[PDB]
Design an enzyme around this catalytic site. Sequence first.
Site, PDB file in Angstrom:
ATOM      1  N   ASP A  33      26.674   9.647 -29.519  1.00  0.00           N
ATOM      2  CA  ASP A  33      26.374  10.772 -30.395  1.00  0.00           C
ATOM      3  C   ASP A  33      27.414  11.885 -30.274  1.00  0.00           C
ATOM      4  O   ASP A  33      27.778  12.514 -31.272  1.00  0.00           O
ATOM      5  CB  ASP A  33      24.977  11.332 -30.109  1.00  0.00           C
TER       6      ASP A  33
ATOM      7  N   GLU B  91      24.019  18.947 -36.454  1.00  0.00           N
ATOM      8  CA  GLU B  91      22.763  18.894 -35.735  1.00  0.00           C
ATOM      9  C   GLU B  91      23.003  19.150 -34.245  1.00  0.00           C
ATOM     10  O   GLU B  91      22.173  19.757 -33.570  1.00  0.00           O
ATOM     11  CB  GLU B  91      22.108  17.530 -35.895  1.00  0.00           C
ATOM     12  N   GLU B  92      24.144  18.685 -33.744  1.00  0.00           N
ATOM     13  CA  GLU B  92      24.489  18.841 -32.339  1.00  0.00           C
ATOM     14  C   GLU B  92      24.997  20.220 -31.923  1.00  0.00           C
ATOM     15  O   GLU B  92      25.291  20.437 -30.746  1.00  0.00           O
ATOM     16  CB  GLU B  92      25.523  17.786 -31.934  1.00  0.00           C
TER      17      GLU B  92
ATOM     18  N   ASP C 161      24.734  15.117 -39.945  1.00  0.00           N
ATOM     19  CA  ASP C 161      24.067  14.564 -38.786  1.00  0.00           C
ATOM     20  C   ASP C 161      25.073  13.474 -38.401  1.00  0.00           C
ATOM     21  O   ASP C 161      25.134  12.427 -39.046  1.00  0.00           O
ATOM     22  CB  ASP C 161      22.729  13.942 -39.182  1.00  0.00           C
TER      23      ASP C 161
ATOM     24  N   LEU D 195      25.227  11.281 -35.990  1.00  0.00           N
ATOM     25  CA  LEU D 195      24.624   9.984 -35.707  1.00  0.00           C
ATOM     26  C   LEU D 195      23.100  10.101 -35.778  1.00  0.00           C
ATOM     27  O   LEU D 195      22.452  10.504 -34.818  1.00  0.00           O
ATOM     28  CB  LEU D 195      25.052   9.502 -34.314  1.00  0.00           C
ATOM     29  N   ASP D 196      22.527   9.746 -36.917  1.00  0.00           N
ATOM     30  CA  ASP D 196      21.081   9.832 -37.088  1.00  0.00           C
ATOM     31  C   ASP D 196      20.338   8.601 -36.572  1.00  0.00           C
ATOM     32  O   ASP D 196      20.789   7.468 -36.753  1.00  0.00           O
ATOM     33  CB  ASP D 196      20.748  10.067 -38.564  1.00  0.00           C
TER      34      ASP D 196
ATOM     35  N   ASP E 172      27.510   7.809 -15.909  1.00  0.00           N
ATOM     36  CA  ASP E 172      27.215   8.786 -16.947  1.00  0.00           C
ATOM     37  C   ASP E 172      28.220   9.928 -16.885  1.00  0.00           C
ATOM     38  O   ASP E 172      27.862  11.070 -16.586  1.00  0.00           O
ATOM     39  CB  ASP E 172      25.794   9.327 -16.764  1.00  0.00           C
TER      40      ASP E 172
ATOM     41  N   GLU F  34      19.512  16.494 -43.304  1.00  0.00           N
ATOM     42  CA  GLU F  34      18.705  15.280 -43.315  1.00  0.00           C
ATOM     43  C   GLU F  34      17.928  15.227 -44.629  1.00  0.00           C
ATOM     44  O   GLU F  34      18.113  14.312 -45.435  1.00  0.00           O
ATOM     45  CB  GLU F  34      17.739  15.222 -42.117  1.00  0.00           C
TER      46      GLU F  34
HETATM   47  O1  LIG Z   1       9.605   9.023 -33.658  1.00  0.00           O
HETATM   48  P1  LIG Z   1       9.385   9.697 -35.003  1.00  0.00           P
HETATM   49  O2  LIG Z   1       8.576  10.983 -34.893  1.00  0.00           O
HETATM   50  O3  LIG Z   1       8.836   8.751 -36.056  1.00  0.00           O
HETATM   51  O4  LIG Z   1      10.864  10.149 -35.519  1.00  0.00           O
HETATM   52  C1  LIG Z   1      11.624   9.303 -36.399  1.00  0.00           C
HETATM   53  C2  LIG Z   1      12.693  10.153 -37.050  1.00  0.00           C
HETATM   54  O5  LIG Z   1      13.484  10.805 -36.020  1.00  0.00           O
HETATM   55  C3  LIG Z   1      14.855  10.756 -36.361  1.00  0.00           C
HETATM   56  O6  LIG Z   1      15.485   9.912 -35.417  1.00  0.00           O
HETATM   57  C4  LIG Z   1      15.429  12.152 -36.247  1.00  0.00           C
HETATM   58  O7  LIG Z   1      16.809  12.155 -36.576  1.00  0.00           O
HETATM   59  C5  LIG Z   1      14.964  10.171 -37.770  1.00  0.00           C
HETATM   60  O8  LIG Z   1      16.131   9.391 -37.890  1.00  0.00           O
HETATM   61  C6  LIG Z   1      13.678   9.362 -37.902  1.00  0.00           C
HETATM   62  O9  LIG Z   1      13.252   9.359 -39.260  1.00  0.00           O
HETATM   63 MG   LIG Z   2      18.918  12.679 -37.654  1.00  0.00          MG
END
Ligand SMILES: O=P(O)(O)OC[C@H]1O[C@](O)(CO)[C@@H](O)[C@@H]1O
Ligand SMILES: [Mg+2]
EC number: 3.1.3.11
Lengths: 327, 327, 327, 327
Positions: free
Chosen positions: B66, B89-90, B110, B112-113, B60, B272
């Site tokens: 990300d 976001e980061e 974002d 990497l979403d 690591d 988002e």
């Molecule tokens: O585990 P949860 O609360 O459903 O979160 C899912 C959401 O979290 C995220 O990963 C946040 O970016 C979204 O891509 C996704 O819609």
């Molecule tokens: Mg996201």
Amino acid sequence: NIVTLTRFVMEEGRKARGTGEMTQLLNSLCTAVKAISTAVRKAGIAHLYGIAGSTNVTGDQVKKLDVLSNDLVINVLKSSFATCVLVSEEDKNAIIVEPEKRGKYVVCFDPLDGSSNIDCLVSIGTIFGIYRKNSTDEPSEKDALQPGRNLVAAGYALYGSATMLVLAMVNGVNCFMLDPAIGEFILVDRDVKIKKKGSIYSINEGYAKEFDPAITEYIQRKKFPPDNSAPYGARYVGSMVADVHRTLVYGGIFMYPANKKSPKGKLRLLYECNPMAYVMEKAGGLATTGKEAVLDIVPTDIHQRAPIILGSPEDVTELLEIYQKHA
Amino acid sequence: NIVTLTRFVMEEGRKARGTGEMTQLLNSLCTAVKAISTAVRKAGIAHLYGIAGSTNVTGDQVKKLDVLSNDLVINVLKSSFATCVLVSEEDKNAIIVEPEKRGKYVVCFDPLDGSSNIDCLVSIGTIFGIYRKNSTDEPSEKDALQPGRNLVAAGYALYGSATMLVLAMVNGVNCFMLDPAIGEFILVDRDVKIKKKGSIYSINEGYAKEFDPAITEYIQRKKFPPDNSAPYGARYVGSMVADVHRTLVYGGIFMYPANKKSPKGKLRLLYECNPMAYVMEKAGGLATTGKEAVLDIVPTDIHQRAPIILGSPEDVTELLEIYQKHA
Amino acid sequence: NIVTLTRFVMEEGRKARGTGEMTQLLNSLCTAVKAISTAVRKAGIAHLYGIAGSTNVTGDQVKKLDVLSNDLVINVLKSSFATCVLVSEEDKNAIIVEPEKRGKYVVCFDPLDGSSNIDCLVSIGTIFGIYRKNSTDEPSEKDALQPGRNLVAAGYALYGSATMLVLAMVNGVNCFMLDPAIGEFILVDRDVKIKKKGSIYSINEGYAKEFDPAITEYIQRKKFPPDNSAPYGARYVGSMVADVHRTLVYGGIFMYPANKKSPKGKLRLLYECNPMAYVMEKAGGLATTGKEAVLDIVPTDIHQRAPIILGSPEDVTELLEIYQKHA
Amino acid sequence: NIVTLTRFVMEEGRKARGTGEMTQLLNSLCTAVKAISTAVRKAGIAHLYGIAGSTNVTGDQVKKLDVLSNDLVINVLKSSFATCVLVSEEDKNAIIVEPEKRGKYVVCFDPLDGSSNIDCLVSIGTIFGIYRKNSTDEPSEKDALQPGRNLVAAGYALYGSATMLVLAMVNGVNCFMLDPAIGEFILVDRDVKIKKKGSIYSINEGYAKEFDPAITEYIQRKKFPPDNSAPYGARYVGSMVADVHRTLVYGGIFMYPANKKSPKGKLRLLYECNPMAYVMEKAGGLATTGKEAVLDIVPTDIHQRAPIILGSPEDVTELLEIYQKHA
Ligand SMILES: O=P(O)(O)OC[C@H]1O[C@](O)(CO)[C@@H](O)[C@@H]1O
Ligand SMILES: [Mg+2]
Ligand SMILES: Nc1ncnc2c1ncn2[C@@H]1O[C@H](COP(=O)(O)O)[C@@H](O)[C@H]1O
Ligand SMILES: Nc1ncnc2c1ncn2[C@@H]1O[C@H](COP(=O)(O)O)[C@@H](O)[C@H]1O
Ligand SMILES: Nc1ncnc2c1ncn2[C@@H]1O[C@H](COP(=O)(O)O)[C@@H](O)[C@H]1O
Ligand SMILES: Nc1ncnc2c1ncn2[C@@H]1O[C@H](COP(=O)(O)O)[C@@H](O)[C@H]1O
Ligand SMILES: O=P(O)(O)OC[C@H]1O[C@](O)(CO)[C@@H](O)[C@@H]1O
Ligand SMILES: O=P(O)(O)OC[C@H]1O[C@](O)(CO)[C@@H](O)[C@@H]1O
Ligand SMILES: O=P(O)(O)OC[C@H]1O[C@](O)(CO)[C@@H](O)[C@@H]1O
Ligand SMILES: [Mg+2]
Ligand SMILES: [Mg+2]
Ligand SMILES: [Mg+2]
């Protein structure tokens, strides 16, 4: 020391003192998966949209991804000279290999799983199970009708954010990540074992009105924990390979029980349930229909369906206990 | 004629009689997306595992996916000479671009979403929103606090079975498939429009115990239709970008309302909610918090969260009716 | 039936009833070549020019293509557990493999041939020769000092317009084209045989003032044919692998005799001359220093040089006759 | 900041205050080059050899590389909406673009140069020359018959160990390396200039018996320097694009004079000589026929041949002196 899938199968073949036939077969599978992967990621799609005009195909030559995958597996496996019987979700009857290329292995497979997620680009994959011909009779479908517990090798290839091939045999489950840059599967997870208990449940709750009391009680318990703990998170990709893989890596439980539309469940026993059940058990997980072990079912139809619950030990047994209670 | 993202962008720039700055911005965005896609698919992973020796940093110590993605976006965007303010976001604070590379645009993204789906290789992606700097005072975070309604362009790149970039601007939503073979995005569906009503609902039923009465009633209707019609199917990948894309293509509804642990929802407004809301409205869909249009919210914090309900007009409207039904 | 290099080596191993060690070795070589190829084509070079900024390398980590190739071969071969002695053009002394990974094979190789064409992007390649340890003594350099005629396998990989791996063993020479899309070498030429007589001569005429009378007379004959026929065309890439490969495929003659700067010729016997000489002879061609068979030379220095003339039978014998005449 | 071909072109377009048409043209050229590069490297060749079944067209029924390349260029260029006339080596007459896709530019090109080096996998490439339509009358072949001096842009793409695109315009010659990993050309050397004098001569000495007295004397000087300095080294790949690039980078001289069988030389004026001559002069080099500047010749046939001598100024000037020496 880096380990490629190619070095691994060869070595495992050496340790087993095999004649090399199964190895050549596993190597073929590896080649097939890379070809399917490359196609799934849409390499060369610009040609379909006429980047070079319209002159190549003298006729009308186009193929759906699922069809192409099926052709890749069938041809690649046959060219290995290691199989005698092939069972595809895409073919109504078993495929009996010509004598000139006939081998001792029987291969059941889903060339491209998760068809409903194809057009929306969601993760999809290829599932496979391998048996050894248990007979002296002319090769036929019967040779494919063995219980899962007889499998010699099983696994799948996941075409997600990245492509990964998970292979399970008698001595464990190993995951290999595909490096597209050099076309090589690299071992990145060795004797993989699933968590005893997870925190995620996976099921299509749209069938809620068709679930049995056991499933209904369990789902309720996941949302409103009797011990007042944090409820499990829900996740359902819609592709078995993707939902099952997350289950292996993160733990938890995956379910696809019987309903109106499917009194015997929806998923296929030979090339969907059994392979995943074998992977799960080799990783210390469980796989039941709710009443019996998936790998113990002696099939009577190559395209037979089966109910399936799999994943972490404690999670699956908890549901099994609900089933036993209601009984 | 075949149309590449590059040709498309350049033409929309000539029609709009733009000075060429926004075009350079989109050109850069496109390049960043490709670089991210290649890293996500794991090209060169063999090097990380000692393919060429030097096996010591195996643990690591190297950039996480990300982080690498975030670096690509920031660096590539700055190098476009088209931006002045960036919100990631980061990053805790907004990035103010050097005067030497400063342009007139503001970008919220974002990198990497779908972070929870990374380790299990489930579909993930990149989301972006572009604003035109209006005020004359020195660039600051306030420049990124405009309501989504002011968006000049918004969209996302989905790293699924295949990679696709979806771009929405004033006159439409267009989808481009990435051909990795030549590093070119091909236009495959022009002025995209979502269907009026779907047959799929997407939400994490894990927070059932936390849902407000409206959501609870709506879900009840999807599983147990009062008029006895067919129940909706359920789908929840866990990555907004993946669930939203399927919503755009197959129709239906996606939901992330506010739950106890998340009184103002979980998803972020700037990078988002607004981008996805913008793509949805331009496609003839709707994006509401349950009481107001997502795009009308006046942001007060670049990391502000907001509840969101988006998808097919009829499905979203039905839930809105329920919300107002409960006063 | 399509045939991959992987299926071929495995099958040839089976037909030979080998224990599998050499196969695992050939498979390793295959993996090494793909990695070198990918690097040579400059994949990921954008990272060198900071597409993601400057943050990855915490220090000063950069590597010349030739150095990287050398590291790939050394590591990849050692990780095959099939070798005991390695000879690289890049290392002054032979590399003796640790006992834990020690195998019975000796490998002599040029990791990246044609260094003078590197910066100008001209075709380059990797050359290799494989021997079996002929001894019971502690592995050492001597184990590498065997005449070419003892080789068990030899060949090269050409990184030209496309990448091709040519492999020669006792039963013939086979050429496999690399499909970068799936990372697979496909057999496209089987029991390859060189034309008895060609129409192309390959030599660096800049050394004209240093050539012996035999070479001088032959070159003259190629330009002004005594039989008044069409003179041979001239071709000299500057990279041995490229010039030699064209010679195999098109026929003709390749030469690199001794001169002032090189009284014993320039090319290395162990990992340049011998491998190419073995390939040539297995294809029905000839390879001489002008006075003796290259494969019959018993080396005394792992980095020893040798004069070399190779190619079509009639062409080489014609020059050999000039040498015999002058004698 | 890292600079991609795409960003570069777009910026030169903004500086030049162009309407964006030439930019779209270069953008298209770039896309074509990438598609050609991928086909040349053989991606998807496994399909041609029955990887997915359907093994019948295995012979000579599918497009040859040169034909596919030509199709890509023509189709991609037309689709730019920037051209009106196209001249290809593979077409007897000039291509007049439909009024619906007609633009103001004229393009002369060699889709795949180095045809004799194709089967042996030696380096090959693509050459191009762009003119601005001047006359007002309907577009015709006469529009492509302007002297190289009128060129607006010229260059080439070399498919060697790695792929590189070299572009020359009014203010310079820039080299861009193609990163296949992301389908992006990266600027790696800006305002390129050739060295005043090299130490390498490139010519097919096979036509020695046909050379004029000047060439003959010049070659004599390179092998047997009168002043007893070091002899030049010789290099002749056989593909103009490969020999010319090495000339640009390493310096030296490249020659293809007229021989008996080729009284007016072999190389084509419009799409081989002029483009390379333009790149050379912009780099501070020279390109002569031995009596006149290549770029000054007034073309009378789009397939007209012309002798050419190009490279380092001092080397070219020395030969010119010899030409005038022989009256
Ligand atoms: O585990 P949860 O609360 O459903 O979160 C899912 C959401 O979290 C995220 O990963 C946040 O970016 C979204 O891509 C996704 O819609
Ligand atoms: Mg996201
Ligand atoms: N590559 C391998 N990996 C694991 N087990 C193998 C392998 N090759 C052979 N075996 C085992 O040895 C048996 C006989 O192999 P074979 O002679 O190749 O058909 C197989 O059915 C397996 O049980
Ligand atoms: N490539 C493009 N595509 C769409 N709209 C564009 C483009 N380029 C410019 N525009 C429009 O013109 C405005 C000014 O462009 P610019 O001069 O590049 O800042 C932008 O804010 C857009 O509304
Ligand atoms: N893949 C193979 N191709 C060709 N010959 C082989 C192969 N494997 C083994 N052999 C031959 O068998 C010998 C013993 O092989 P091994 O037991 O693997 O060291 C080798 O030295 C070769 O002569
Ligand atoms: N991308 C560009 N790079 C260099 N010069 C350009 C570019 N675009 C336009 N020009 C110059 O401007 C002229 C007119 O451009 P256009 O309006 O696109 O036809 C061209 O002939 C070039 O001389
Ligand atoms: O839409 P449903 O009924 O949940 O079916 C989804 C299931 O069907 C399949 O697509 C069938 O292979 C599985 O991959 C997936 O688990
Ligand atoms: O410049 P010279 O003397 O012709 O040397 C070229 C030779 O040297 C090498 O680069 C040495 O490996 C060969 O590939 C090539 O045949
Ligand atoms: O065999 P010759 O006469 O030397 O021809 C070589 C020339 O032919 C060509 O292939 C013609 O395109 C050039 O690339 C090269 O310079
Ligand atoms: Mg399936
Ligand atoms: Mg060498
Ligand atoms: Mg040519």
